[PDB]
Design a protein around this ligand. Sequence first.
Ligand SMILES: NCc1ccccc1
Ligand SMILES: [Ca+2]
Length: 223
Amino acid sequence: IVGGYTCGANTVPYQVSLNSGYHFCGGSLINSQWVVSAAHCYKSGIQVRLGEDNINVVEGNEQFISASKSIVHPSYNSNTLNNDIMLIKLKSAASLNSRVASISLPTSCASAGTQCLISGWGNTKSSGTSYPDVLKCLKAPILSDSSCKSAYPGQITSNMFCAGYLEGGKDSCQGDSGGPVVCSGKLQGIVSWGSGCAQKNKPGVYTKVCNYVSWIKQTIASN
Ligand SMILES: NCc1ccccc1
Ligand SMILES: [Ca+2]
């Protein structure tokens, strides 16, 4: 997250870190057994880390649970990033408490202009590299579809939305991928892609979760 703020420990209780020996992507806990992330975060050998603030210090509220199954969306296209969504099943159920909690799936798609909360442990610099140890947060509005399509001509599908600031300076970044975009208390986006971080006229692009609720619910009911 570039241009954000320190969230505060366990104030984003649905945020997870995906670990393969090191943090590599975020995700969101949607019930006691299942995490949503980005398909482009797929790896074999994922451990899900819940209850984290500092990812390099064991602080006492963590739960570390290995994945038993990953399911990339059937229509994921890694070239275009269309359908950039993946479900991860935990080997055992998480213990839900005030520091580890699920986020609800949406009923309706969020509206342009709504302020959302984006969070992660990704790079904090627009130019250069600095990775934080504690969770960072950013408030950013959903942009109009016409603004989004003008920023990325020929590249925006109906399964994507843009959020952020056309003037630059505040954005998600590398290492935030797969993490949550929460608007009005519901999971509306997944950190997906963009052109760099916090550059002018190049806002972040997010997977539009409201288009996938049927697939999520069917998949959970069968696995
Ligand atoms: N600035 C959007 C973004 C997010 C994740 C990875 C790359 C770019
Ligand atoms: Ca920790």
